[PDB]
Amino acid sequence: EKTCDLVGEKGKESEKELALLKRLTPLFQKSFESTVGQSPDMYSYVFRVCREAGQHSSGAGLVQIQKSNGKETVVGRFNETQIFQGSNWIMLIYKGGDEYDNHCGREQRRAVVMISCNRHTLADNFNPVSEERGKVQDCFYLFEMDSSLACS
């Protein structure tokens, strides 16, 4: 599809989530990236809101590129989106990423993005915070970003 897909058959989706996706529409045409870590784990993270961020038309909402060997790993897909907000933040979650091999019980990767309110920018300061891969399940990659859209 062209945009984010929420849980629930068409018509049985949360009115709250739908309204939030609409609120983030200005960000759809943007692309965000951040390179972090040192060899052999230097990565380049590419994140997009409800739009393809990879190069294989797999529906990746956020990908990780092994700088060493140009390996592209899907961290999360926008067809499995969850989104909710607090008083001055919005959390976006892309599930359905590529499966781990020797971690987290071979579960699919998932991307968690915490968008904090910042009245001075529409979108800025995207950066990978950490990766939790030491659990038997429910692992994830955490990212943060600023946006005036998360201000209520």
Ligand X SMILES: O=P(O)(O)OC[C@H]1O[C@H](O[C@@H]2[C@H](O)[C@@H](O[C@@H]3[C@H](O)[C@@H](O)O[C@H](CO)[C@H]3O)O[C@H](CO)[C@H]2O)[C@@H](O)[C@@H](O)[C@@H]1O
Ligand Y SMILES: *[C@@H]1O[C@H](CO)[C@@H](O[C@@H]2O[C@H](CO)[C@@H](O)[C@H](O)[C@H]2NC(C)=O)[C@H](O)[C@H]1NC(C)=O
Q: How near is the Cβ of 8 to ligand Y at its closest, in Å?
A: 10
Positions 75 through 104 that interact with a copy of itself (CB under 8 A) = 82, 84, 86-87, 89
Among 63, 83, 87, CA closest to 74: 63
Question: DSSP string of 15-42?
Answer: HHHHHHHHHTGGGTT--EEEEE--TT--
Instruction: Count the site residues for Mn ion by CB under 5 A.
Output: 1
CA angle 13, 20, 54 (to 5 degrees): 90
Give contact residues for ligand X (rule: CB under 6 A): 40-41, 64, 66, 69, 71, 73, 100-103, 131, 133
Q: Which stretch binds Mn ion (CB under 5 A): 100-108, 115-123, 126-134, 144-152?
A: 100-108
Range 65-95 burial, b when 16+ CB lie within 10 A, else e: beeeeeebbbbbbbbbbbbebeeebbebbbb
Mask of contacts with ligand Y, 71-90, x by CB under 6 A?
------x-xx----------
- Pick one of ligand Y, a copy of itself, ligand X, none as the site partner of residue 37 (Cβ within 5 to 8 A by kind): none
Q: Does 54 bind ligand Y (CB under 6 A)?
A: no
